[PDB]
Copies of this chain bind each other. A is one copy, B any other.
């Protein structure tokens, strides 16, 4: 039992912000060294961060326009990862001098990566388009690395009861979310779950922008898991009105991307519907969001991972309850999908 992830699907490799034109970005993804850089025309490129000569990482190399020269013996490679120049001996450039390229897709303020040996299926990139709609200082992205298996983070985000007791002022729901039985639906595309409640005051994240900050407000959490590790939490607070349409609301995306078995690249994006222009505040939010996850959620999930050791979640006979229905359905669906994928790996080997 060496670890198995879904291969076919689109994982978030990096925030759009993390590749600064000239910069040679490197990151480990599904246990693979990956280099990224942009070209002249902004076009992002992903390669195996590994020169095929003596296996030196390429990110350590020097950039040469839209080509990378490896820092060891200076073989250059183009964006397609064929060798453009050998400066040794006769000069002849071996057919074998190729870096494998990773199909990228730059939507929702992230670089999505296709790791599998097959051709990409841009179809499978799920539709989180509302992030791309509206004044650009409402949408913002943060990254957190955590030394845990990805499915522990998903499980946290799918069981939002935790917010009552885990989290401090910034988003605390004050014991009110826990008692609510959520409406959960399995579908062919996604797995949804909706919590509704009310508290006093409203969650600090929304309260100041409400009609009466101090006073009570109805809240809604609609989430949906999509393969391999994406969850699109929509949240907000209405006062007075029954129609949630007026709510001081928000479109979030929690996505994970495993580094290996027990490390995980955890990306978050908000897009708020309130004071949409103010980038001075947008930074102050997304910083105070990252804070909440990294400082309050981070340590519990990591603590759990340590107490769990390497042993598979269900193997430890967890005492599952009212609030664990959604996060199980996920783990099982993902499990079923992984086996189904391994099947039609050996069946696409035939066909």
From the candidates B56, B299, B316, B324, name the one contacting A300 in the complex (CB within 8 A).
B56
- A52 lies within 8 A of chain B by Cβ: yes
**Contact between chains at B97 and A319 (CB < 8 Å):** yes
CB distance from A282 to the nearest CB of B (A): 31
- A162 lies within 8 A of chain B by Cβ: yes
**Contact between chains at A300 and B87 (CB < 8 Å):** no
CB distance from A61 to the nearest CB of B (A): 9
13 additional contacts, CB 8 Å, given A53-B319, A87-B164?
A54-B155, A55-B307, A55-B318, A56-B300, A62-B165, A72-B166, A73-B159, A86-B322, A88-B161, A88-B178, A89-B179, A91-B179, A96-B317
Which residues of A does B touch, CB under 8 Å?
33, 49-50, 52-57, 60, 62, 69, 71-74, 86-92, 94, 96-97, 155, 159, 161-162, 164-166, 175, 178-179, 181, 299-300, 303-304, 307-308, 316-324
**Contact between chains at A303 and B57 (CB < 8 Å):** yes
Q: A55-B304, A178-B73, A307-B56 given as contacts; is B164 within 8 A of A86 (CB)? A: no
**Contact between chains at A165 and B74 (CB < 8 Å):** yes
Distance, CA A88 to CA B182, complexed state (A): 10
**Contact between chains at A318 and B56 (CB < 8 Å):** no
**Contact between chains at A72 and B178 (CB < 8 Å):** no
Residues of B within 8 A of A316 (CB): 55
**Contact between chains at A303 and B88 (CB < 8 Å):** no
Residues of B within 8 A of A318 (CB): 52-55
Distance, CA A174 to CA B55, complexed state (A): 23
Distance, CA A50 to CA B162, complexed state (A): 16
CB distance from A146 to the nearest CB of B (A): 15
CB distance from A197 to the nearest CB of B (A): 13
